[PDB]
Design a protein around this ligand. Structure first.
Ligand SMILES: C#CCN(Cc1ccc2[nH]c(N)nc(=O)c2c1)c1ccc(C(=O)N[C@@H](CCC(=O)O)C(=O)O)cc1
Ligand SMILES: C#CCN(Cc1ccc2[nH]c(N)nc(=O)c2c1)c1ccc(C(=O)N[C@@H](CCC(=O)O)C(=O)O)cc1
Ligand SMILES: O=c1ccn([C@H]2C[C@H](O)[C@@H](CO)O2)c(=O)[nH]1
Ligand SMILES: O=c1ccn([C@H]2C[C@H](O)[C@@H](CO)O2)c(=O)[nH]1
Lengths: 264, 264
């Protein structure tokens, strides 16, 4: 898509070369925002074939409050493999924080139930937020949260969402993150009987890895096609019981997949 | 300032009317970003006169870990009085989260000295973050954190910072919030022997209150003046040892002050 390809070109034209924790090397910029009107289509990139079943299984895994890759393995999704301990655990990452933020006093906060109840009982609230940046638990995590903090907003019957992503792999992780959160806004709007508005993406250290330069140049020479449409086949009795079968994308015609080395 | 007056005009041209917890009513946009190059000048608005005293004393108060207004009273700062209880207390707001975020197991994390240690030993980290958004303590706070989350970045010997502000009173609070953070970026750069880079402001619910519209069009009819210059007269032993007198603003020639009521 055009917003995405523009950001790729901006990192190649303006990026500063940095040494990163993996010793791979990076071209980097700081501070970027992009806006996706969800009325205009599902923001799934078309200049390379994205694999939607990993995106939706990971999100359903987050909403169930789970931090073990077993569910993901039952569904053949491999994305979290090299960050899990010998027992399949990643520590209190996203799922644990969304569904059960631990207080110092033993209790737990369910930020997703809280956000649902806010959108239904108080839509004008300027605090409809969920954070995964639990400073008291970052130590205990296999990886610190990249998509750290997000906020929902309602205006004329429409639900918007803004993500703060502190660390972004433009070639590999960012297509995956945009579609994952656009999916969540569609699920939330359906449970809350609202229309979809904008998905706003804001990034911190926004970067392209040195060994992704050829892959980037190939994608950057491809023309963006029309965006797909997301069909949610049934309306579940809560945001905690959607299943892989409920989601469909008509009109998705992408360019070939493009393989790229993952950095660990 | 140019960026600032452009934002006021954007929420006027594109904002939608919203009801809010204070009952006052607001014009509102969601999702905005702007960049202040701190090498160009200190970003203190010139289209109306701003009170530096309260900005500097509130930052110094935050950095001490203090959440009681007694300090602010010893210095004639009354900006936090409406929210403070009978004992001068605001609950675990900014100062406490910044200096002593409580973990699930007894511990307390000082996010400011962690950030200083990362800028010295690891300035290319993508994790140099301070969060005030402690989900576990929100209900003990006088008010939920508006300037909620921020991130530092280093590139060509320069320190940059991006703030996510979830709720923003564009007329009354935002002049205060960008001078406060630009000041923190100069204090941090001075401590780490870095030069100043960019302050990136990102807003969630960015708004103008209904009873601020004539003041806003009044300000908006004024040409921005030359941006002031910050002179720090001393290099203290630590970020916690700065004093009001160490800072001098040079060349601040603002248009007349404009009074406006605070929403409850
Ligand atoms: C973001 C996020 C979640 N994640 C987690 C995650 C964890 C560590 C990371 N590390 C690095 N260096 N980059 C990433 O983008 C990244 C992403 C993902 C993990 C892998 C792929 C990936 O390699 N994508 C391939 C194949 C995926 C598939 O078969 O579906 C692709 O071609 O798209 C995508 C997302
Ligand atoms: C942001 C922040 C901290 N705060 C805290 C804070 C708390 C609640 C709020 N509530 C509302 N509705 N708007 C705010 O901007 C706001 C700000 C402030 C509080 C008061 C003033 C204020 O009245 N301003 C000056 C007027 C002139 C000037 O701007 O210089 C004053 O009289 O002191 C500014 C900042
Ligand atoms: O959801 C995610 C997770 C990780 N990353 C990137 C950030 C950095 O490049 C590396 C490790 O966090 O993978 C993303 O872009 N998105
Ligand atoms: O740092 C601050 C604190 C408060 N506000 C505004 C937000 C909202 O309009 C009201 C209450 O949080 O005051 C700001 O803009 N900045």
């Amino acid at each position: 898509m055009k917003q995405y390809l523009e950001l790729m070109q901006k990192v190649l034209d303006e990026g500063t070369q940095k040494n990163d924790r993996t010793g791979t090397g990076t071209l980097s910029i700081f501070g970027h925002q992009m806006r996706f009107n969800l009325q205009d289509g599902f923001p799934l990139v078309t200049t390379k074939r994205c694999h939607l079943r990993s995106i939706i299984h990971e999100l359903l895994w987050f909403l169930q409050g789970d931090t073990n890759i077993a569910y993901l393995h039952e569904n053949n999704v491999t994305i979290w493999d090299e960050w899990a301990d010998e027992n399949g655990d990643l520590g209190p990452v996203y799922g644990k924080q969304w569904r059960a933020w631990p207080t110092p006093d033993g209790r737990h906060i369910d930020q997703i139930t809280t956000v649902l109840n806010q959108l239904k009982n108080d839509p004008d609230s300027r605090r409809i937020i969920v954070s995964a940046w639990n400073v008291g638990e970052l130590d205990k995590m296999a990886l610190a949260p990249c998509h750290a903090f997000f906020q929902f907003y309602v205006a004329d019957g429409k639900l918007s969402c803004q993500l703060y992503q502190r660390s972004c792999d433009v070639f590999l992780g960012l297509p995956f993150n945009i579609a994952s959160y656009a999916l969540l806004v569609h699920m939330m709007a359906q449970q809350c009987d609202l229309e979809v508005g904008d998905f706003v993406w804001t990034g911190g250290d926004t970067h392209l890895y040195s060994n992704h330069m050829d892959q980037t140049h190939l994608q950057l020479s491809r023309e963006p096609r029309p965006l797909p449409k997301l069909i949610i086949k049934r309306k579940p009795e809560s945001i905690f019981d959607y299943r892989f079968e409920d989601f469909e994308i008509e009109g998705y015609d992408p360019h070939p997949g493009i393989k790229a080395p993952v950095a660990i």
